[PDB]
């Protein structure tokens, strides 16, 4: 019953908050966000995302950086940096989600907390990351 969009937004919120709470653990930050309003599957999914992003962060950050020039990853807003990380993680490691969905919903988050320009920006980066790194199993889903 809990929408995928809400589950993913919790993951995003935890990453966002972590940037200003570096002394705390990302996993615990996520538990603060997850409450009775999130169902069993959503909590399980969010927990897996956070652990997968943390485990693969170096690889993910390096990958994204190969599509950035003027705007380095640390110069982007806390919103765009973490939307790119979360989307890249989803594109590479979450098997059942179509590329279009990952990209479209990631752009929604960027626009949600930024502008149409921020969104078009992220849309551009993700389109490029996807056309070169999307897993073959997603070539048609």
**Residue ranges per structural domain of the chain:** 1-141
The CATH H-level (homologous superfamily) assignment of domain 1-141 is NusB-like (1.10.940.10)
* Solved using: X-ray
Q: How many CB atoms are located within 10 Å of the residue 118 CB?
A: 20
Tokens 């179509």, residue located: 98
- The answer to whether the CB of 54 falls within 8 A of the CB of 30 is no
CA–CA distance, 2 with 18 (Å, rounded to integer): 23
CA–CA distance, 139 with 46 (Å, rounded to integer): 25
CA–CA distance, 133 with 129 (Å, rounded to integer): 6
- The answer to whether the CB of 92 falls within 8 A of the CB of 67 is no
Documented resolution in Å = 1.7
């Amino acid at each position: 019953k809990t929408p995928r969009r809400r589950m993913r937004l919790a993951v995003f919120k935890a990453l966002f908050q972590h940037e200003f709470r570096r002394d705390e653990d990302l996993e615990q930050i996520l538990e603060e966000i997850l409450d009775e309003t999130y169902d069993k599957k959503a909590k399980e999914d969010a927990r897996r995302y956070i652990r997968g992003i943390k485990e693969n962060l170096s690889m993910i950050d390096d990958l994204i950086s190969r599509y950035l020039e003027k705007w380095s990853l640390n110069r982007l807003s806390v919103v765009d940096r973490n939307v790119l990380r979360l989307a890249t993680y989803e594109l590479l490691f979450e098997k059942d989600i179509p590329i279009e969905v990952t990209i479209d919903e990631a752009i929604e988050i960027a626009k949600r907390y930024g502008t149409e320009n921020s969104g078009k920006f992220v849309n551009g980066i993700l389109d490029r990351i996807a056309k070169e790194h999307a897993p073959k199993e997603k070539f048609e889903l």
